[PDB]
Each structure stands twice: as structure tokens, then as C-alpha cells.
Design a protein around this ligand. Structure first.
Ligand SMILES: COC[C@H](NC(=O)[C@H](CC(=O)NOC(C)(C)C)NC(=O)c1cc(C)on1)C(=O)NCc1cccc2ccccc12
Ligand SMILES: COC[C@H](NC(=O)[C@H](CC(=O)NOC(C)(C)C)NC(=O)c1cc(C)on1)C(=O)NCc1cccc2ccccc12
Ligand SMILES: COC[C@H](NC(=O)[C@H](CC(=O)NOC(C)(C)C)NC(=O)c1cc(C)on1)C(=O)NCc1cccc2ccccc12
Ligand SMILES: COC[C@H](NC(=O)[C@H](CC(=O)NOC(C)(C)C)NC(=O)c1cc(C)on1)C(=O)NCc1cccc2ccccc12
Ligand SMILES: COC[C@H](NC(=O)[C@H](CC(=O)NOC(C)(C)C)NC(=O)c1cc(C)on1)C(=O)NCc1cccc2ccccc12
Ligand SMILES: COC[C@H](NC(=O)[C@H](CC(=O)NOC(C)(C)C)NC(=O)c1cc(C)on1)C(=O)NCc1cccc2ccccc12
Ligand SMILES: COC[C@H](NC(=O)[C@H](CC(=O)NOC(C)(C)C)NC(=O)c1cc(C)on1)C(=O)NCc1cccc2ccccc12
Lengths: 222, 223, 222, 223, 222, 223, 223
């Protein structure tokens, strides 16, 4: 698994691969790991599939639950604290093999500057968290390759489209060096999934755009 | 990790590094470990990140909770006892790897002499505490280097600025001998965080003065 | 520890960091990890210091021993096999904590094409080896970060100078993300060690050149 | 145990404390831990007493053995390699509790400049070694405190005597923060042992000189 | 740690050293291990600092609690029983390393003879206790050296001052043979703490007198 | 530890030594191991001191409690069952090292023959018990030696004094072969404690009397 | 077990108790633990009986063997080194429970000053040794009590007789606080064994003098 998220002027982008494995065997090619959990936040999770899906689902339910009960959504800090408390809740099972780590990307509608309102938060198995001031982050077995790629490709990020490109290329390098992360399947037409979040909210990036960016990277490398 | 705190005439200073690690890997460069827990108290914590942040947050809430309920803040002894009780509460989990040790620095507004009203209190995993009557203390994987540096540099502390400088220098020696402690990152402009507390209260030291003290020490060591 | 090696047109370069650690504690700043083992080969080793220096020293002695006994040096394949057998000999102790992995860089004087006579060979704890065809390779606790940096910077290698620059930059990224790898110490003036090898043999790169490249990289990043 | 060694202009100095312990119990007050191993090298050992003394004894015998067999002393590098091979020989017993680490101080008569001919070499349990070019080094349970003291006191080293003072003061700080390291006993008149090495060879520092330096340090610390 | 207590005609004395250790490291020089627990009782504790201080504090609270609730202080036997029950309560934690043993010194205001009203009680980790008639007792890592010293010096005890001296000298021998016990620090001016208890109650011995006696013994041995 | 009890015509006697040990170290010389638990019953206990005293105190309280609640003391069988249930209750702690075994001696006022009203009951760590129909019994680390001595000396028991004597002599042989059992300390004047019980109740034997018997035995052994 | 040795003007004295135990059980009252190993050295050993006596026997044989082969006895340093090497050889078995530590007292015929020619050397399980300058030393389960007693009684040592008295009194205090060490048995007439060594050699001290000193000490403590 590899999930990337990066800040661009006025927004954030998050993308994740599509592969599911049981040991060395490939058990899935179309799996979705990045979910829109609220109008201004997306979550991508790596680890045991059952645990990850329950995380995303229950988290979305918790945020909207608070919103309907109290008439206003949580502050971003609140969203972070709730996700952290959930992650730490799972620590016992994680020590027994049911480990799952999330990566949170959001747009803080209450931020001062609408261009640096993007937010990227990473978490550890004990619920600790860090708000990323450096612009990008990743999670999963390929996260090191993706972070190290984005370290070199990040200067090219000037808008949402260049940022999406850099994200997909980071996933490309991750899948290049990690067998548990799946690259773009040009035969089956399966590509990473991506979500973009700006002042207008969070929207799923269409499959075709990701396809074009993939083929562009592939032919750039040949 | 290294957190240092020292008393200067009429106040106390506490500063902490910015590095977060998973084993040998550097997982963070901007992490904040020193928090103002109440108008006259700051706490810096070392150890598992999750437990450290939960400690600081819950502790701040506990103090102010008492203050709003009873109309007066806790005595400093009370603050000490509460932090200790919290740590001892965590001892069981700590023995399973979730260890976190705090260091408390405060200004006792009810003390007899406002010159020596500074307080530095250290803790162990079992809830033990020591009120330091020798002027400085540190906690974390680099704490020994920082204490031994302050042992030689402490005689130079006469003002808030000299004390702050000695603190950041202690963190410098710590980062010099401990890879788990982050030194000043001059490329990214990331420096230790510091909080100073005197009779006027507790304030975060502005980043600029820390950068100036860092770059000053770095230049001071280059021949 | 991080040791890097890359091929450039007509030669090969190898560089290594200078840090020695005992757990979290820094026990050395001037440590040398890359050794010229013969007129046309250098070896860099990662792991337990005692075992690493013992490997380098014993290996150089073994190569020159064969050379004086039989009047001609070993073929490069032979040098590879002997280093491999040494690593495989240490496997038992390696499982008990005395692990050391080598990285071999050489210039094959018997190669057909002299512009591609550079050789980079990597090893595993069981004595397996691979002659690296992609131009670069690394070993050590920061090797993943350095490989991912070279993956992006390798297009810039056209001579010995650009290749050396890329090597030092890879070590810079390694030290940037790995606390067990030491970066350039501008206060003490301690920089990585490097060895460069071409048709004229293997020579130590003078420290002042590595330094100039270091400041170039740092400055480039501010 | 704490053994310190530092380079001074034209020579090297090595000193060690006098305490022997069984856990918390003090089983010795006068033990000698720094030995003259040959005309131009001294060795100090920390760890299990039996293994430490056997190290020093056997090592001296081995060096003089080579000298008598081949008519010339070993090169300094050769001396290093032999001590290292010995330690690595003890690795297994060290894993079972009989650990002993040496610290080597010497004067290389074949060095280029007779000014920086001092040599200080440290070792690890597996036989690894480091030639220390930063001028000072220590080994033992108090080595971190002593190293951190010398890091601040080293600029005062300008001759053999200032270096000797800095050695004794480092051992003082070590004993100050480490209970397994013994400080100067003014009641019994027992002080650290020292060896000085220059071009004229290695000689024991006389007890009276060290006593003077110790008392100066003590009464300097009591105002 | 070493805590000593001895009976003198018409009273009792208790003294304790000032050192705090973490293994071999000295983590404290000024700690106080002897506490006045009520107008006629003092307690000194050895072992884990946290447990020791909580013992002294909670014990004082318990005694004064009974006194205010029922209008009369506990009988000495009662005080003994409560301290014992506390120590027994801690047995499990002690078995996992948080061991702390107290030593109790008091003046029994209800005693038959007002000259033998001093009381010294020792405890073990399981809540057992012994009322000491041999006249002296000690606890801590140096307790054997101090007891064996007092066995020889006790005949010199005839009043409060001779008894205090003998106590400080016992602590001197304790610190002399035990690295976990601190002797008098003439540089910092830190000396053992002592409490004296007679018919007028329990009062802290001023630091000046203990310092004088410590110097007398030191210069007596040189 | 050694506690003995034996029946004589019209009564029962129980005696115990005075030594307390922590491993090989002697931690007590004046200790008391035999307690009068009610007007007609005494208990002697061996094992961990804390558990033993808790047994004696709690047991006495339980018996007198029943007596005040129901207006009549328990039958002897009932007392037996209560001690048994207490001992069984302690089984878990006993496995983990807090072992304590009692020996019960009493005078049954409801017996048919007032000369055979003496009772001796022994217990095991799991609460099993046996009423001793043979005149003597002992418990503790020297219990085997005391039993083997009484096996040879029991023929001489005809009254309270002869029985008391055989008892003290059994304690003498026990202390003679077991270092955890203390013999008579003629220097400090510390002797075993004894309790005698007849139709007139249970009384402590005065220290002076046992002293006389000890000296008598010692003289008999010197020829 | 307790073995003591102390230097007196011009000689050395060693004495040891007579008790042998299997755990808490006393399996011996007459054992000898101090042996004359050569004309000028005696050794007393504590620990497993089999290993201890084997040490004494084998050591005596080794020394006399060297003397007959080479025509001259070993230097004292040589004797120490051989005893230490033997102890070290036993380390493996010792960690398996067959531990035995010796204590060596001798008279060095090659010493400069015949008044300070007495030598007392102690050993640990790994073969380490210390030559005792402090004047006295002991080994065994009661060694700490005996050493702490001699610490107060040593000023009274002025000749062989005062030294012997101080040794016996040390063994008395050791046996007073340690159950594995036997005190003087006045009923059986068994007392510690002692050996005295001066320029005329090493001789067994006659039992009568030890008995006289024992009764003197006993009366001194019983008013
Ligand atoms: C590191 O481990 C790899 C992990 N693999 C896994 O998590 C696999 C999931 C799997 O293959 N299931 O089979 C089907 C349902 C697809 C047919 N666990 C297990 O097989 C498993 C776990 C336990 C316990 O027993 N079996 C993974 O693929 N993780 C990626 C992932 C992330 C977010 C959402 C996902 C949803 C579905 C599948 C994968 C998802
Ligand atoms: C265990 O000693 C090292 C410790 N490391 C840590 O505490 C790390 C924190 C971490 O790496 N998180 O990664 C993110 C959140 C940045 C993505 N825990 C763990 O890796 C961990 C432990 C268990 C169990 O599961 N995970 C540390 O560096 N501690 C330093 C530290 C001290 C005070 C406040 C802090 C606040 C935030 C981060 C760090 C802080
Ligand atoms: C195990 O990863 C950390 C490793 N460190 C080490 O390997 C250290 C070396 C060390 O610190 N020694 O201290 C002094 C006295 C030499 C200064 N060994 C040990 O700590 C060690 C291993 C055993 C067994 O016992 N001790 C390391 O830094 N390795 C890097 C390294 C690679 C190649 C050549 C080197 C030569 C010298 C020093 C380091 C070298
Ligand atoms: C490792 O822990 C501390 C170490 N202590 C020690 O090593 C002690 C020494 C000791 O007390 N011996 O007692 C006699 C010889 C005095 C009777 N042995 C053991 O604890 C020991 C360990 C095993 C196994 O067997 N014995 C020490 O103090 N070491 C300091 C030291 C360093 C160099 C040379 C020395 C020579 C003599 C004495 C000490 C020396
Ligand atoms: C291991 O037995 C030794 C024991 N040491 C200790 O108890 C030390 C005390 C300590 O160093 N704390 O650190 C600060 C707060 C001083 C900075 N804790 C621990 O070793 C410890 C235990 C666990 C679990 O985690 N840490 C001790 O010194 N005990 C002596 C002692 C007795 C009575 C009252 C005391 C009060 C304060 C300090 C000491 C006191
Ligand atoms: C375990 O067999 C030996 C046992 N000894 C003991 O039980 C000792 C007693 C002791 O030394 N206490 O300290 C003071 C209060 C005396 C200073 N505790 C322990 O060994 C002990 C056990 C645990 C757990 O922690 N400590 C013993 O001697 N038992 C004999 C005994 C029997 C009946 C009543 C007694 C009353 C007081 C003392 C002893 C008594
Ligand atoms: C376990 O530490 C105590 C030790 N006791 C002992 O060493 C006892 C001696 C013993 O009782 N043997 O029984 C006979 C010989 C009387 C039949 N061995 C054992 O208990 C033992 C150990 C193993 C293994 O198997 N048996 C001891 O008493 N040591 C004292 C001692 C020291 C020097 C010379 C001695 C000579 C004879 C007897 C004792 C001597």
C-alpha cells in the first residue's frame, strides 16, 4: 500500500494505489483506499483491509454525527483529535496484527489564508499525530519511496493539476520499488484513485485524468 | 529528545528540541514538545509522542478545571502532586513501551522571595519528583549531555537572556552527542522551542531570538 | 551508515558517510567506511564496525596475496566471488548481531568497452550478490533514501564531476532522513569520504572537493 | 570506573579513579586501573577487575615479547591491532558478564611531527577501535560525565600540567555524578592515578602533584 | 539509602542520608528521607522514592485523620498496625520492583516508665514488624554497616547529644562502605537530616549541629 | 523456626523458639511465635512472620467474636474448622512464598475425662488437619529433630513440670541441628516462650522458669 | 562461613569458624576451613566444602611441586597468581552452584621491612584479587559483620596476642549475626581455628588460647 498527500496553493491532493495482497499473492486490483470522509476532508488508510475500511466508515459517521447533533461541523483540530483517539483505540488489536494507519488531508475553512488552508496530518499506531508543515506526506509499505520522490518533484507544484501529477508520479515510483503497491495497469485500465480538496470542497478526481497523467509519466520514462 | 529547564534571577526558562524519530528514521523536524500548561507553568515531555501530548493536554485541562471550579489556582505543590499522580497512573502502560516523562518549570506566585520564586521539578516513571534546588535540569535521551553542559555553563546565568542562551546551548550539546535529539536546522530555519516564565507570567519565546542564539552558538564553535 | 556508488562514463565513484553510533549515541564523527582494496577496486561496508574494518582489511590482503602468488590479479568475477565467500562465512555471527554488508565498486581492465567498464556489485548477508546494471546502488540504514535520490538525479551524470556531485547529494539526502547517517559537518569541517576509479586506477577524492560540493548542495537547498 | 585520557602539546596524559565495587558495595578504595604497558604506551581498563588486569598484564607481555623476538618494537598501528584482537577474543565471556574495555594512550616515536605524536585509541566489545583526533576520550561508568566536562575544559590545555589538571577535574565531575567512580579521599589521602607520556617515555605522575591539583579543585568548588 | 534510629535516656533519635540514585548514577544530593509524621512520631523510608514519599505522606494523613475524627490520637500499637498494613498493601508492586521499607521512631506518651518511652519499629516488605529492644536499628542498603557500627558505639550513648553523634557516625560508616549512601558533603554543605523525639515531642535537629558533629568525626578520623 | 506441643496428665504445653531470619542473616532474637488465642487455646505458627501474626490475631478475634455474639465459646471442633478454613484461605499466597503453618494446642472443657482433655492439632498448607493421638507434635524447620527427641524423652512426662522440661529440651535439640531455630541465649538471657493449659486455663510460663530448665539441660549435656 | 585475617606488627593472623551447613541444617561442628598451605602462607576458604578443600589441597601441592622442581619457593606474587588462576578455572562450575572463594594470608620473606611483611589477599569468583592495605579482611556469609567489627576493633591490635583477640572477636560478631557461621560452643568445647604467621613461619594456634579468649569475650558481653 502507498498513499500520498500534498499541499498546493489553495488546496490539497491525496491519491492511493489499488492493490490488495495476501503475503506475496495479489488478491485485488481495484481496491479503493482513499475516501471522502467529509465535505472538506479525505482519509487514506494502509494496513489490514477490514480495519482500514472500518476506520474510514466509522470516522465519517462520527464527523457527520457531531455535525447534525450540534448544528456546526467540528473544527479541524477536533477532527484530528477524534481520528487519533480512534487509532489509539485500535492499538491492542494492532499489536496482534490488525494494524491500520490513516493519513488525513483536509481544507480548513476557518484558516487565515485561503491559499495555505491545506492540511496534512499523519498518525502512528499509538494515536500520535503530526500536522505536516513541509507540504507532502505518505503512508504504507511504499511511503518511503513516494516521500523520497516527492522530495525531488515538489518544486514543480504550482496549481492543482501539477500537484496531481506529482502525486501520481510519487505513487508510480512507490509501486516501482514496492511489490505490495500496484502501479497503473494499462491492460485493465486501473489507475490510482485521487481526491482534490479546495475552497469549494472535496471531489473525486476522474479516472480519465489520472489515466492521462499515468501514460504521460510512462512515456516520459521510456 | 532533550528538554532543558533552568532558573534565572526572577524566572525560569524551558526549551526543547524539535526532532521525532522511529528507531533510526527521522519522522519529524518541526515537532513541539514544550507547552505552557497554565499562566505560570510550562511543561516539556519526553518519550512516546502520543502519551506526551495526551499528558500535556490533559494536565492543562486539569489545572484550569480546578481554577474555574474553586475560583483560585492550585498551589505549586498541588500542581506537582497532580502531574506525579498522572505519571504513576501511566506506569503500567509505560512498562509495555508507552513511556513518557515530564519536566515541570513554573513561577510560584505565593513564594516568599520573588527573586528565587522559580521552580524546576523533575519526575520519574513511578511518579517520583524532585524539586531542584541547584538551578537546572533536563529530561530525555540527551539529558545527560545537557546537564553536564549546564554544569559548566551555569555560572554565566545572570539575566533572562543569558539563561535562555545557556538553555539553547545545552540543547546544542545534547544534539551533538545524541542522534535522537535534533539540532538547529539552518537550511529549514527550525530551532528549539522555548518558554520563559517570570512574575509577569509565562510566554513563548519568539522564534527569532532562538534563531539568533542558535546561529550565534554555531558561529561561536567554528574556531 | 550510508554508502553510495554510481557509474559514470569511463569510471565509477563511491562515497560514504562518517558517523559511528552506539544505539542513539554518536560515538564517532571522523569514521572511514570506504576503502581502496586494490589498484582498480574500492569497497564500502555497513554494519558492526569491527566486522566491517576486518572485512575491508582482510579482503585487500587476500586480493594482493593472490596477485603476488600467481603474478596476475584476479579477474573481476574472481574478486566478486571471494568477497561473497567472506560475507557468507560471517553469516552465523551476523545472525547474532555482528552483521556487515559490503558494496563493491571497480573498473574492469579486461572489459570490452572501456566507457562501460565500471562495475558496481551489491551483497546480502547470505553471500548473494548482484552486479548492478542500473548505474547506481547503495547500502546501509539510509540506503533507501539515497537510492531514491539518485533515481531522480542520475540523468545529470555525464562526467566524473557531475557523478561525484550526485553521489554527495545522495549521501546528503540519506543523512537528512536517517539519523544513523552523518551529514556534512561545517563546524568541524568533516565531510564524506570518496573514492574515484577510472582507467588510471583508484584514488581518494581530496576532502576539499567534497566540501565544495557539500556547500554547493546546501546553498542549493536554501 | 572512569578513565580519562587527553592529548596535550607534545604528549598525552591518562588518569583513572581508584574505586572497586560489587554492585552497591565498595570493595576497594586503592585499586590501580591505569598501567604503563610499554616505554611509550599506557593502558587503562574499565570493567570486570579480573579481565581488566589480565588484559593489561598479557598485553604488556605481548608487546615486550615481540620486541625481544624481532629486536624492534611494534609500530603503533601494530600495537592497536594486537589489543583489538585481544578484546575480540574476550567477546564471548563479555557476553556472559566478563566485559572489560580498554583505553589506550601512547606516544608514537615514528610520528612525523613530535608535537602531535600523542595517540588516544578507544575500543568496543567486538574489537572495533577508533583513533581519537579530538584530543580527549574516556571509558567507564562515568565516561559520559568526564567527556562532557573535558568538552568544556579542553581549551585550557596548553602544557602537560594544565592537561593533568583537566584530567583530574574531569575525573572529579565523573565521580560527582557516578557512584561507581571514586573521587579524591582527603581522609585517607587516596587520589586518582595518572600516567604522563612524552618523547622521554611514559612515567607515573607522582601522588603529591595529583593531591595538589585535587585540593585546588575542591577548594575552588567550595568558594 | 541508610536510616538509623536509636534510643537514648528519655528519647529517641532518627537520622538519614541525602542521596538519590538511579542505578549507578547520582540523581539527587539533598533529598529528605526522615519525616515527622506526628507530634510524637517520625518515619524514615528506604527504597523507591515515589513509594517512600507516598508512604510518609499518606501515613501522616491517616494518623491525623484518626485524631480529628475520634478526638484522641492512636495508641502506639495502632500506629504500628496501620503502617504495617500499608506496607503489606504494597507487596505486589514491591514484587515487581517498587519496594520501600519504613523505620518508625516514636515516644509513647502512655508508656509505663517515662525514660524507656522511646520506641523503634522495623518492617519487612510483607507487613511484618518488630519492636526493637536492642536499642538501635537501621534500614537501607547500608543498614548492615550502620548496625554493626552502632553495636560497638552504643555504649557511648548517655544523653541526646551523645546519641545524635552516634547516629551520625553510624551513617558515616554506612556511607563509607555503601555507594548508594551519601556521606557529608563539605563542599556543598549538605548533611544527614535528623529528628529528635522526647517528652516535649518531635523536633527537627538543626543542620548546624549535625554539621558540627560530622566535622568532628571526619577530623577525628584523619 | 520450631514450635512444639505435648500432652501431660491434665494439661498441654506448647513452646517456641525466639529467632527470626532473613535467609542466613539473623533478623531477630526476642521474637514471639506462640500466642494464647483464647482462655483455653494457644497457637504456635511457623513461616513468614507477617502472615503468622495475622493468623494469630485474626484467629483470636474470630473466636472471641463468636463467643460474644452467641454467648458461649465454640466447641473445640469448631475452633479446629475455623483455623483450617483460614489456613486454606491463604493457599494462593502460600504458593507465592507467604507460607505459614499453625499448630493448635488446647484444653477441651467438654471432654469426658479431665485427664485426657488435652488436644494437639496439626495443619498443612492446604487446610488439612489431624488431631494428634500420640502426645506430642512439632512444626517448623527443626520440627523433625524436636519430634525425634520427644520420641525418646516422652516416657519421662508425668506432670506439668516434666512435660515443660521435655518441651524445652526438644527445642534445644532442634536449635542444635537447625540454624533457623534459636537455642537458649545465656548471654542476653533470651529463652523460648511457653504456654501451659489445664482446667484452670491457659497461662504464659515465666521466663525465669524456662531459664532454669535451659541451664539444667545445658549442665546435663556438659558431664 | 566466616574467615578473617588481619595484620599485626611483624606478622599476620587468620581464623575461621567451624560450622558446616546444608541449607538451614547444621551438618558439621568440627570442620577446619583454614589450612597451612606452605611454610609462610595459609589459606581459608568459604563456600562449597568439596571445592574448598580441593582448592587448599591442590594449591599446597602446586606450591611445593614448584619448590622441589626449581629448588626455590615461588615469589609471593607468584603464589597469588597461581591461586587466582585456580579460582578462575573454577568459574564455570561456580556459576553452576559449586562456588568457593579463598582468602590468602602470608608472610613475604622477600619484603623490605619485616614488620610490614604480612600480606592479606582476597579473591572473587572470576580470579580477581586485591592485596589488602587496610590491614584486615574477611570472606564468607558473615564477612560483612566481621569486617565492620574489625573496623572498630583494629586500633587495639599491637602484637600477636591482641591481633588474635581481635580476630576471634570478629568471628564472634559474625556468628552473632549470621546463622551459617558458628560461634564458640562451650558445651562441646569447639572453637574457631586460627593460624599465625611471622618470620619464624606459620603455626597452628593452640586451641587453649582461643578458648581463653572466647570465654573472655563472652564474659565481656554478659556484664
Ligand atoms: C499490509 O497488508 C496488506 C493488506 N492485505 C490485507 O489486508 C488482506 C486482505 C485481503 O486480501 N482480503 O481478501 C479479499 C477480501 C480481498 C478477497 N488481509 C488478510 O488477508 C487477512 C487478515 C487477517 C487477520 O486474516 N486475513 C492490504 O491489501 N491493504 C490495502 C488496503 C487498504 C485500504 C483498504 C483496502 C480494502 C480492501 C483491500 C485492501 C485494502
Ligand atoms: C519513542 O521514542 C521516540 C519517540 N517517537 C515516537 O514516539 C513515535 C512517534 C512518531 O514517530 N510518529 O510519527 C508521526 C506521528 C510523525 C507520523 N511513536 C511511535 O512510533 C509508536 C510507538 C508505538 C507503540 O506505535 N508507534 C519520539 O520521537 N518522541 C519525541 C516527542 C517528544 C515530545 C512530544 C512529541 C510530539 C510529537 C512527536 C514527538 C514528540
Ligand atoms: C551497528 O551500527 C552502528 C555501528 N556502530 C558500532 O558498530 C559500534 C562501534 C562503536 O561505536 N565503537 O565505539 C568506539 C570505542 C569504537 C568509538 N559497535 C558496538 O557498539 C558493539 C557491537 C558489539 C558486539 O559490542 N559493541 C556503526 O556506527 N557502524 C558504521 C561503520 C561502518 C564501517 C566502518 C566503521 C568503522 C568505525 C566505526 C563505524 C563504522
Ligand atoms: C564490573 O563491576 C565493577 C568492577 N568490580 C568487580 O569486577 C568485582 C571486583 C571485586 O570487588 N573483587 O573483590 C575482591 C577481589 C576485592 C575481593 N568483581 C565481580 O563483581 C565479579 C563478577 C564475577 C562473575 O565474579 N566476580 C570494578 O570495580 N572494576 C574497576 C576496576 C577496573 C580496572 C582494574 C581493577 C582492578 C581491581 C579492582 C577493580 C578494577
Ligand atoms: C533504586 O532505589 C534507589 C532509589 N532511587 C529511585 O527511586 C529513583 C529516584 C530518582 O532518581 N528520580 O528521578 C528524579 C525525580 C530525582 C529526577 N527512581 C527510580 O529509580 C525509578 C523506579 C522506576 C519504576 O522508575 N524509575 C532511591 O534513591 N531511594 C532513596 C530515597 C528514599 C526515601 C525518600 C526519597 C525521596 C527522594 C529521592 C530518594 C529517596
Ligand atoms: C521465612 O522464614 C523465616 C521467617 N522470616 C521472615 O519472614 C522475615 C522476617 C523479618 O526479618 N522481618 O523484619 C523485621 C520486622 C523482623 C525487622 N521476612 C521475610 O523474609 C520476607 C518475606 C517477604 C515476602 O518479604 N520479607 C521467620 O523467621 N519466621 C519465624 C516467625 C514465626 C512466627 C512469628 C514470628 C514473628 C516475628 C518474626 C518471626 C516469626
Ligand atoms: C553450601 O554452602 C555451605 C557449605 N556447605 C556445603 O558445602 C555442603 C557440605 C556438607 O554438609 N556435606 O555433608 C557432609 C560432607 C558432612 C557429609 N555441601 C553440599 O551441601 C552440597 C553441594 C552439592 C552440589 O552437593 N552437596 C559449607 O558449609 N561450607 C563451609 C566449609 C568451608 C571450607 C571447608 C569446609 C570443609 C568441610 C565442611 C565445610 C567447609
Amino acid at each position: 500500500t502507498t498513499i500520498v498527500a500534498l499541499k498546493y496553493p489553495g488546496g490539497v491532493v491525496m491519491a492511493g494505489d489499488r492493490r490488495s495482497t495476501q503475503g506475496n499473492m495479489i488478491s485485488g486490483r481495484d481496491v479503493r483506499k482513499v475516501y471522502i470522509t467529509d465535505d472538506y476532508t479525505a482519509t487514506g488508510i494502509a494496513g489490514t483491509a477490514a480495519v482500514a475500511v472500518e476506520f474510514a466508515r466509522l470516522y465519517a459517521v462520527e464527523l457527520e454525527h457531531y455535525e447534525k447533533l450540534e448544528g456546526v461541523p467540528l473544527t479541524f483540530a477536533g477532527k484530528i483529535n477524534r481520528l487519533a483517539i480512534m487509532v489509539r483505540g485500535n492499538l491492542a488489536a494492532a499489536m496482534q496484527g490488525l494494524l491500520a494507519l490513516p493519513l488525513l488531508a483536509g481544507y480548513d475553512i476557518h484558516a487565515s489564508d485561503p491559499q495555505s488552508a491545506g492540511r496534512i496530518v499523519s498518525f502512528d499506531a499509538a494515536g500520535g499525530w503530526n500536522i505536516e508543515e513541509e507540504g507532502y506526506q505518505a503512508v504504507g509499505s511504499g511511503s518511503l519511496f513516494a516521500k523520497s520522490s516527492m522530495k525531488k518533484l515538489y518544486s514543480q507544484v504550482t496549481d492543482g493539476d501539477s500537484g496531481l501529477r506529482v502525486a501520481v508520479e510519487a505513487l508510480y515510483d512507490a509501486a516501482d520499488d514496492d511489490s505490495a503497491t500496484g502501479g497503473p495497469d494499462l491492460v485493465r485500465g486501473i489507475f490510482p484513485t485521487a481526491v482534490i480538496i479546495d475552497a469549494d470542497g472535496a471531489v473525486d478526481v476522474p479516472e480519465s485524468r489520472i489515466a492521462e497523467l499515468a501514460r504521460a509519466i510512462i512515456e516520459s520514462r521510456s
